[PDB]
Paper text:
HAPLESS 2 (HAP2) is a conserved sperm plasma membrane protein that is essential for gamete fusion in a diverse array of eukaryotes. HAP2 is homologous to the viral class II fusion proteins, which fold into an articulated rod made of three β-sheet-rich domains, termed I, II, and III, with the central domain I flanked by domains II and III in the prefusion form. Domain III connects to the C-terminal transmembrane domain via a flexible linker, while domain II bears the fusion loops at the opposite end. The crystal structure of the C. reinhardtii HAPLESS 2 (HAP2) ectodomain (CrHAP2e) revealed that this broadly conserved, gamete-expressed transmembrane protein has the same three-dimensional fold as class II viral fusion proteins. It was proposed that, like its viral counterparts, HAP2 initiates gamete fusion by insertion of fusion loops into the opposing gamete plasma membrane.
TcHAP2e only crystallized upon limited proteolysis using subtilisin. The resulting purified protease-resistant 40-kD fragment (termed TcHAP2esub) crystallized in the hexagonal space group P6122, and the best crystals diffracted to 3.1-Å resolution (crystallographic statistics are listed in S2 Table). The crystals of TcHAP2esub consisted of domain II with a short extension into domain I. There was continuous electron density for the loops at the tip of domain II, and we could build the polypeptide chain unambiguously in this region, albeit for a 2-residue break immediately after strand b (i.e., in the bc loop). Monomeric TcHAP2esub domain II displayed the same conformation adopted by domain II in the trimers of both AtHAP2e and CrHAP2e. We were thus able to superpose the TcHAP2 domain II on its counterparts of either the CrHAP2 or the AtHAP2 trimer with reasonable subunit packing, suggesting that the postfusion TcHAP2 trimer would look very similar. In contrast to AtHAP2—in which the bc strand connection is basal to αF and away from the lipid contact area—in TcHAP2, both cd and bc connections are located roughly at the same level at the tip of domain II, suggesting that, together, they may comprise the membrane insertion element. A surface representation of the modeled TcHAP2 trimer indeed suggests a relatively flat membrane interaction surface with a tripartite nonpolar patch comprising V129 (in the N-terminal side of the bc connection) and L167, L168 and I183, F184 (in the variable regions 2 and 3, respectively, of the cd connection). As anticipated from the aa sequence, the loop preceding α0 is stabilized by an extra disulfide bond, numbered 5b (middle inset). Although the domain II tip of TcHAP2 lacks an amphipathic helix and in this respect appears similar to viral class II proteins, such as that of RVFV Gc, the elements required for binding a glycerophospholipid head group in the latter are absent, suggesting that TcHAP2 uses yet another way of interacting with the lipid head groups.
Residue numbers in the entry: 99 to 126, 129 to 214, 257 to 367, 371 to 382
The structure:
């Protein structure tokens, strides 16, 4: 007669997020950062053949990094002063092999069959669910729910205009103030890979994981009419 309490949330696809974006450095004719296909990083294009703004990266020369103790250790410009002075180095935003699908979530809707509940349903509205989506044949994609991640929307940059957030893109990468006097790889911190790695390490240390979906509970994704559901511990009142 009695059934278990169920909590379902509607899933809303947002975009694909790269697991670990990285900065490729190209040694240099000379360094070209012009909005043309002649650029060192090269121009990226949408499926319509339109150039993606800020995709050509930027060049960095020694510059004021010449002056002892002005630029921080490991900065873009400083690397030119030391190994390639006179020349310029291209900073290119590149995307890793692995990609995740980002889903926004709605409100929890209770379910039963034969009122105050035992456990209160978790707020998933202000969070985002990440599921490995490509290259498909990849270990992580095959690994299923084990590899899903759940982050607060605060850690996500939807449009990619914000540095050190999930979904960071060309707009945030160039457009960094004083970019050449900044550390190599700046802006590409706190990514999905970092969120996973931080959990796996803390887990091996016998600590509480905070990002992977498994630390939130055991879920089920059904393609009805798509929803994300979990079973509440306990029973009806």
């Amino acid at each position: 007669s009695k059934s278990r309490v169920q909590y379902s949330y509607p899933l809303f696809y947002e975009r694909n997020f790269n697991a670990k974006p990285y900065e490729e450095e190209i040694t240099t004719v000379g360094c070209d950062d012009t909005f043309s296909p002649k650029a060192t990083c090269g121009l990226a294009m949408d499926t319509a053949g339109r150039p993606i703004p800020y995709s050509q990266g930027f060049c960095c020369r020694c510059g004021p990094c010449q002056l002892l103790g002005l630029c921080p250790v490991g900065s873009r410009g400083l690397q030119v002063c030391d190994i390639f002075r006179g020349a310029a180095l291209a900073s290119c935003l590149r995307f890793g092999e692995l990609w995740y699908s980002g889903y926004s979530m709605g409100s929890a809707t209770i379910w039963y069959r034969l009122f105050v509940p035992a456990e209160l349903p978790l707020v998933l509205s202000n969070k985002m669910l990440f599921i490995p989506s490509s290259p498909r044949i990849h270990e992580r994609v095959l690994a299923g729910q084990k590899e899903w991640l759940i982050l607060d929307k605060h850690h996500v940059s939807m449009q990619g205009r914000d540095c050190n957030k999930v979904g960071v893109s060309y707009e945030a990468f160039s457009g960094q103030g004083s970019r050449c006097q900044l550390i190599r790889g700046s802006c590409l911190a706190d990514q999905l890979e970092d969120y996973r790695s931080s959990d796996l390490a803390v887990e091996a240390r016998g600590g509480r994981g905070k990002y992977l979906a498994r630390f939130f509970g055991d879920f089920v994704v059904n393609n009805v009419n798509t929803r994300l559901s979990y079973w509440m511990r306990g029973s009806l009142a």
